[PDB]
Amino acid sequence: DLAVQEIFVFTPKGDVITLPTGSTPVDFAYAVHTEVGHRCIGARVNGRLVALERKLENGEVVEVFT
């Protein structure tokens, strides 16, 4: 019940995905591509490369690849 600070992200396609504070690429990947999420290898934020442990940014373009 507590908490509230929610996060929002955008995909290269234009779609928008809502995620809770501290949302990692793994969650986003699994949400979008079941394969990527299942065995995520890399991710890119706003065209830039990032690690799987890198926290997802709100409004930024999140990318993930198995």
Residues 6 or more apart in contact with residue 56 via CB below 8 angstroms: 7, 9, 19, 23, 24, 25, 27, 28, 45, 62
Instruction: Provide the residue range defining the domain that includes 35.
Output: 6-65
CB 38 within 8 A of CB 5: no
The count of structural domains within the chain is: 1
Residue 24's CATH number: 3.10.20.30
- Is residue 10 assigned to a domain? yes
- Is residue 47 assigned to a domain? yes
Nearest to 61 by CA among 17, 23, 21, 22: 17
Structure tokens at 17: 């995905």
- Is residue 1 assigned to a domain? no
CB 16 within 8 A of CB 8: yes
CB 39 within 8 A of CB 52: no
Place of tokens 């290269």: 12
CB 35 within 8 A of CB 42: no
Q: Which method, experimentally, gave rise to this model?
A: NMR
CB atoms within 10 A of CB 10: 16
